[PDB]
Each structure stands twice: as C-alpha cells, then as structure tokens.
Write a protein that binds this ligand. Structure first.
Ligand SMILES: N[C@@H](CC(=O)O)C(=O)O
Ligand SMILES: N[C@@H](CC(=O)O)C(=O)O
Ligand SMILES: [Cl-]
Ligand SMILES: [Cl-]
Ligand SMILES: [Cl-]
Ligand SMILES: [Cl-]
Lengths: 242, 242
C-alpha cells in the first residue's frame, strides 16, 4: 500500500557537493545549499521530521546508494544520477533535475573534445575518473571497452588538485557543478566539447517504498510551480571568475 | 514484491500522435513510429509478449491515463506527460524523454511570447487548448486563474484547422511533435517564444506495480546505451518544409 509522510521521521542522507550541499566549519558544521532548501520545501509541505545526515567524507556516490540500500538512511537527496545499475537496488523519485556531463581540463590544454579521448590523444592513465560515480560507468562503456585504465580519483578535491598539478590531463564532471566550479572557484580550469551522457538526478528511496507516491507528487508539484527552477537559479546563477 | 516480465503478456495502450504512434489504414490498421520501435526494443530485452492496443480515436491523454488506472491496459506508452495530478492515480517509469511546450501559431502572427497571452493581447476564445492534455492544466494555472475560458479543441487536427482557418490565433504544443508538424506537414504554422512547462514523458504503469523495477532498469539501459537517442533521431530529424 501507500501512506503519507506527515509525522514520520526520515533519515536523509546528503553528500558534500557545492552548491548542492555546502559544508561549513563554524565555531560545529552548518549545512546549506540547493539540497537543504529543497529539504525545507518538502518538510514544510509534507510534514516529516528531517534528520539530515551528512555522508562520511570520501563516501562515494555509489557508496551512498549502497548505504541506503543496506538500511543506513531512509532517503538520499543530492546530485545523484539515476542509473540502471543503481535502479536494480534502490528506487528513485521523479527527477529533480536534468543532467549531462562535460570534460574538465586545465586552460591551455590541447584537447578539442571527446574525440580526443576516444582517439587516444590522451594516455588513458592521464584521464582522471572519480570512482563510484556514474561517469566511471560511462568511461568504462564508451571509452575504454571495459578496461579500468583511468587514473582513479577519490574526491573532487583530488580531481582539481591533480588537474592543476599536471598529474592528469582531463576528467569528467556533471554540468551543473562543472559550470559552478569553473565559473566561481578554479578560474584556471575550463570545460571543453559537447556535453554527453544526458541523464537525470533523483531522490534515492528504498525499493517498493510505502511513501513513494507522496514524495513523487510533491516533487512534481515543485517542478510544475517553478520552485525547482527558482532554487537552481538561486544557487547556480553566479560567476565570480573574470 | 516484484517480478520479471519474461513470458508475461502486457496489454500496451498507445495513442495516435505522429511520429510517436502513426496510424495508417490498409481494411486494417497499421502502426509505426518511435513508440512501436521502443516497444520492440523492450520486448526483445525483457521477453514479455506485447499486446499493443490503439486507444479509440477520440481518447484524450487524461482519458488514456484513467483507462489504465481502470485496468483497461497494463502499461501505456507514448508522448504522455508526467504530472503531479496524474501521479496521484498511476505511477510512471523513468522518463523516456524530456519535454517542454511551445506556442503554436500561423506564420506572420505578431506574438513575442507567453507574455502576450498573460497580458491579454489575445481574446480567450482565440486561444485554443486541447482538453485533457497537460497544457490545459498549465493554462488554468498560469493564464486564466482556474477558468475554462479558452477555445476548446478536441484533437490536434482541430487545433491545426482552427489556426489555419483563423478561428484561433495560438495554441500550445509539446516541442517534439510541434517541431515535427511545423517542419514537415504544416509549413505555414510555426513556433514562437521560449519553451515552457519543462517536464518529462514516462511510461504509465499501475501504482505499486509488481514489474516497476524490471521496466525502469531496462528503460535506463536503453538511455545509457544510446538507443533512445537513436530512436529520437530516426523519427524526429526530418524537415520536409522548404
Ligand atoms: N552525479 C554523480 C556524482 C558526480 O559525478 O559528482 C553520481 O551520482 O554518481
Ligand atoms: N503530452 C500531452 C499531450 C499533448 O500535449 O499532445 C499530455 O500527456 O497530456
Ligand atoms: Cl520524471
Ligand atoms: Cl522498486
Ligand atoms: Cl528519470
Ligand atoms: Cl504509487
């Protein structure tokens, strides 16, 4: 059957990613961003108690999904890509956003786009890929014919640091955060080529979840009334870099 | 619980909409299009037995959803918009396509965008709306404050004929089919303004369906491997108009 979430306490997994989920050390931690605002909209509308739980550091996106599937959270909200492999083990709400990926590199690097990766212009071990991301599965399917021959990265920070230090030549990033970081944080990083892997972000829930309909109806309502677009503008329509 | 669809007969509701589901006579009816190709892809991967059932000629999109909810079909596949109100009574698969709407008009008409409809540049009886479509709920929320004061249309054909005959000045149409019709069939109709009501198309299923996971995993696999993009290119890239 089904039921409403009013009165229910949800352990909500979130995962650090600026400006979706922003973690500030203050003197304890304070969370802000698109995700926290979305949670407030849902909490206010649906009446659950939000127990927001930040995933341990270097928890991967796949790791978060697996932790939820094992019972560690009730839902997980973030820049979490809906994939076939994940859908085998968890359900997803209606999509909160479209998504695609872009190629991230250091400015001045002689790469014109994806054909340069697919034609072997870049040594495979100088392509950095964040393990436990949807981008890893894309790489393995479309670039390397299944071979794990990329330079593995444990976090976005390692991705940025390795690019800037010249340890890797390129990586992949979701478009929203890719634009955000290159337009606001690392002015010397840039995006190149057409976007790829058109996909979506969804809220992760247990399979056959009692509260599936309540959540979906609410997400769709926020879509239809322009709230999701408002939140995207609020958090993403900014550019500090000259 | 859950089950796989292999060997199981699915009654699949489809609805006329070129080039998603294209209906030809000779007496017998022949069906072709993106939808029919998609059914074949899913059938081959999942192993179900497809019992494809064209909805009666005058069936509306809301009517199709309600027919499914009533048990008249097992799933429905088409250019069917995922909306909050529909999600109250049926579930939807992971999206098969993004969607948005555009303003449809005769070439030459002096309309800049949605502002003209909101500012009252157009008499309400000269705005045609196809009843029982998602666009009707958009009109009611954004334009008329709940009043059904539009020129009601019973079909796309009535929409085109009424625009060409000058009985109405504008209507709304989903972008995929709007581009197709104005680029191939009605060369003297055109689209104007920014797209609006960003949404998705999904396969309609019963709520709490036994087979939800099997279907979603397979749809996401078709997305990831590029089949959905191939199908879109195949059916929508054409442009016959000079
Ligand atoms: N959206 C990706 C994470 C990332 O690329 O940052 C995922 O869910 O795996
Ligand atoms: N996609 C619309 C139908 C249409 O606009 O042709 C719906 O599901 O209501
Ligand atoms: Cl959706
Ligand atoms: Cl499920
Ligand atoms: Cl989706
Ligand atoms: Cl449901």
């Amino acid at each position: 059957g089904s039921a409403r979430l009013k009165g229910i306490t949800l352990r909500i997994g979130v995962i650090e990613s600026v400006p979706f989920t922003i973690v500030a050390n203050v003197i304890t931690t304070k969370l802000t961003g698109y995700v926290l605002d979305l949670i407030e909209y849902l909490r206010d509308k649906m009446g659950f108690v939000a127990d927001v739980q930040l995933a341990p550091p270097n928890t991967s996106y796949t790791g978060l999904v697996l932790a939820l599937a094992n019972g560690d959270y009730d839902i997980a909200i973030g820049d979490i890509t809906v994939t076939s492999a994940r859908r085998e083990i968890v359900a997803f709400s209606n999509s909160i956003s479209d998504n695609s990926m872009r190629i991230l590199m250091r400015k001045g690097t002689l790469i014109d786009g994806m054909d340069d990766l697919k034609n072997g212009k870049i040594p495979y071990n100088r392509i950095g890929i964040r393990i436990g991301t949807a981008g890893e599965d894309y790489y393995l399917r479309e670039i390397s014919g299944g071979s794990r021959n990329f330079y593995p990265l444990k976090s976005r920070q390692e991705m940025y640091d390795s690019l800037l230090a010249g340890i890797i030549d390129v990586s992949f990033m979701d478009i929203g955060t890719a634009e955000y970081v290159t337009n606001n944080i690392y002015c010397n990083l840039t995006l190149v080529g057409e976007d790829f892997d058109k996909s979506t972000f969804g809220i992760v829930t247990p399979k056959e979840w009692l509260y599936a309909k309540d959540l979906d109806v609410n997400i769709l309502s926020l879509r239809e009334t322009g709230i999701l677009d408002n939140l995207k503008k609020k958090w993403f329509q900014t550019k500090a870099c000259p």
